[PDB]
Amino acid sequence: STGSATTTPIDSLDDAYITPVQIGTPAQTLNLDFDTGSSDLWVFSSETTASEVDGQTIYTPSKSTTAKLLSGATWSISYGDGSSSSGDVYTDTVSVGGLTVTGQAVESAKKVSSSFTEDSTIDGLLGLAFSTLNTVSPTQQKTFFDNAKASLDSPVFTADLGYHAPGTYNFGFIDTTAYTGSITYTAVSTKQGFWEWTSTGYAVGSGTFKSTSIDGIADTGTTLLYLPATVVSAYWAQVSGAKSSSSVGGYVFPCSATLPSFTFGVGSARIVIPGDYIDFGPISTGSSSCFGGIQSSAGIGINIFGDVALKAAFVVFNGATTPTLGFASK
Numbered sequence: 668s669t670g671s672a673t674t675t676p677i678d679s680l681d682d683a684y685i686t687p688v689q690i691g692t693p694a695q696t697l698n699l700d701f702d703t704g705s706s707d708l709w710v711f712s713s714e715t716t717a718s719e720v721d722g723q724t725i726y727t728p729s730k731s732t733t734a735k736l737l738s739g740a741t742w743s744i745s746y747g748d749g750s751s752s753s754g755d756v757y758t759d760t761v762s763v764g765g766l767t768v769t770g771q772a773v774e775s776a777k778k779v780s781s782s783f784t785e786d787s788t789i790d791g792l793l794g795l796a797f798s799t800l801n802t803v804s805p806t807q808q809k810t811f812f813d814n815a816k817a818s819l820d821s822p823v824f825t826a827d828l829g830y831h832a833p834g835t836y837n838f839g840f841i842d843t844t845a846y847t848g849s850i851t852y853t854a855v856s857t858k859q860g861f862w863e864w865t866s867t868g869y870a871v872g873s874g875t876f877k878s879t880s881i882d883g884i885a886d887t888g889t890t891l892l893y894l895p896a897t898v899v900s901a902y903w904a905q906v907s908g909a910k911s912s913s914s915v916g917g918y919v920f921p922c923s924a925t926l927p928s929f930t931f932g933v934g935s936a937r938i939v940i941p942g943d944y945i946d947f948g949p950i951s952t953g954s955s956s957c958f959g960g961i962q963s964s965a966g967i968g969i970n971i972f973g974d975v976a977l978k979a980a981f982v983v984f985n986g987a988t989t990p991t992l993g994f995a996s997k
C-alpha cells in the first residue's frame with residue numbers, strides 16, 4: 668500500500684504545516700501537525716477542557732463505531748517550545764492520504780497548554796519519530812508509520828514542504844518527479860529516538876563551504892533552523908544591522924534587508940536555503956525589526972533542522988531495519 672496527502676502552511680509565515688487525517692467510523696477529519704521530532708498522535712477531543720478549546724475541530728470517540736477505550740492508558744507530553752498536553756487513549760482506524768491503519772492509538776486530550784488553545788488551525792499532532800519516544804503509560808504505543816510499515820510498498824515516508832505554498836507527505840513510495848538530481852542518503856542514529864544525523868558543513872551566501880560535522884535532528888514539527896552559536900553568528904554577521912536580542916529571544920534584523928542564502932552539507936551534496944526562507948517577518952505588528960529563521964541551539968542541547976531547512980529539500984525518512992535519511996534538491 669501507499670498514501671499521499673497534501674500539507675498546507677497554517678499562516679503566511681509557514682509557522683507550521685497541517686495535513687488532513689481521517690479518524691474513526693464514519694470518518695472525522697482533523698488537521699494535524701505531522702511531527703518527525705515526536706511520537707504521539709494526539710487530538711483535541713470531546714474530552715478536552717471546554718475553556719481550552721477555541722475553534723479547533725474535535726474528535727468525538729463516542730460517535731465512532733470503531734473507537735475503543737484503551738483501558739488504564741494515559742499520556743503526557745511537553746515540546747521544545749514550552750507547550751504541553753495530556754489525556755487518555757483510544758484505539759481507532761486512522762487514514763492518511765488513502766493509507767489506512769486499524770487499531771491506531773489516538774491520544775485524546777483532556778488538557779492542552781495555552782499556545783495550543785490559541786492556535787485554532789492545529790487540531791492535534793501526528794508523531795513520526797521513533798516509537799521509543801511515545802509517552803503512553805503503562806503500555807507504550809506505536810506511531811502511525813510503525814503500524815503501517817509492514818503494509819507499505821517500501822518502508823519509507825517523504826516530506827516535501829512548500830515555501831509559502833502547499834506540499835506533500837507520501838507514505839510507502841518515492842515520487843521520482845518531485846526532486847531534481849539525485850537523493851543523497853546519510854546515516855541515522857536512533858539512540859535518542861529522533862531522526863538524528865550529521866551534516867558535513869555549511870556556507871553563508873556565496874561564501875566558501877566550511878567542512879565541519881554538525882549533529883542534529885530532522886524535525887518537521889519545529890519551525891526554524893537551530894544551529895551552534897558559531898555558525899549562527901557567522902550567518903547574521905553578513906546582514907547589516909542584525910543582532911541577537913535577549914528581550915525578543917533571538918536574532919533580529921532590519922526588515923529592509925535582503926538576506927543571504929544558507930547552504931548545509933549532506934555528505935558531498937549541498938542543500939541551499941534561499942535567503943527569503945529565513946525571513947519570519949516583523950517581531951510585532953508594524954515593527955521594522957524582523958525575526959530571523961536561523962537561531963542558536965545553545966541551551967536547547969541539540970541542533971534542529973526544522974522546517975526552514977527541510978522545506979528547501981525533498982526528504983526521505985527511510986524506516987528500513989537500519990534507518991537512514993535522504994536529501995535531494997527540488
Ligand SMILES: CNCc1ccc(Oc2cccnc2)o1
Nearest residue numbers: 700746747748750782783888889
Ligand atoms: C505553539 N506551541 C504549540 C504547538 C503547535 C505545534 C506544536 O508542536 C511542536 C512544537 C515545537 C516542537 N515540536 C512540536 O506545538
